[PDB]
Amino acid sequence: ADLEIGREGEVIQVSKEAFDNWMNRYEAGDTMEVLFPDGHRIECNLKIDRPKNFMNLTFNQKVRPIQLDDIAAVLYGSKMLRNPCVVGFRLASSGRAIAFSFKDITDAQCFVSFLDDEIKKNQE
16 A cells, blocks of 8 residues: 655664565575556666665666765655555665665665665765
């Protein structure tokens, strides 16, 4: 069921065990979808390297690398609606917004928490 967003706009209680599992999978590399403005998606592999402060999107042997340092915002809730599986975030460098869709809500909410930590770090 859709999240309903406040008039103000978009500018999480997940278990630690769930996060730890999420984190292990995607550090290994695991599957998600990148949303696009025209509304099509592509199935990618998302691999997080915490030491290197990058996360790599692999599609068709093509890798869009994202710097963890780069992440500036996470968009996930507060008729404006968001499917719970879909997480949007903005990059500081491009000023662009990207949407990942995860295989379930839990995973999405983990990516939200992971993003939150990186953002706090980045703000120092």
